[PDB]
C-alpha cells in the first residue's frame, strides 16, 4: 500500500531553535499481518487450492 | 535495543505555518536482522547445542 508519509528536517530559516519545516512524502506501506490474514485468514481460495 | 528517538508535531506557535517543534523519545529499537545474524551466524553456540 501507499500512505501518509511525513518527512521534515531543518527549515534552515529563522533564528530560534527547533525549527524543522515539514514536507510530504508518498511512502511504501506494507501491512505484513493484515496482508497474511487477507491471504489465508479472510479468504480461503489460496488455502483450498494448495490443499 | 534502545536508540535515539524523534517525536515532533505542531509547535502551535506562529499564525504562519511550518512550525513543528521537536521532542525527544527513548524508543524501543529491535534489529530483527542483525539480531538473527548474531544469534546463529556470528556465534555458533546456540546452533551447536541444538544440533
Residues of A in contact with B8 (CB under 8 A): 8, 20
B20: contact with A, CB 8 A cutoff: yes
Enumerate residues 6+ apart whose C-beta is below 8 A from A19. A10, A11, A12, A13, B20
Count of Cβ atoms closer than 10 Å to residue A8 Cβ:
17
B11: contact with A, CB 8 A cutoff: yes
Instruction: Please give the method by which this entry was determined.
Output: X-ray
Q: Where would I find the H helices in A1-51?
A: 34-36, 45-50
Q: B14, B20, B32: best mutation site toward chain A, by most A Cβ within 10 Å?
A: B20
What resolution does the deposited structure have, in angstroms? 3.7
Which 22-41 residues of chain A touch chain B by CB within 8 A?
Answer: 22
- Cα A31 to Cα A37, B12, B13, B27, B48: the distances in Å are 10, 32, 35, 21, 35
Amino acid at each position: 500500500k501507499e500512505k501518509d508519509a511525513y518527512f521534515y528536517k531543518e527549515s534552515k530559516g529563522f533564528l530560534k531553535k527547533d525549527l524543522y519545516t515539514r514536507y510530504d512524502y508518498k511512502a511504501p506501506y506494507i501491512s505484513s499481518d493484515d496482508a497474511f490474514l487477507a491471504m489465508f485468514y479472510n479468504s480461503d481460495v489460496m488455502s483450498k487450492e494448495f490443499k
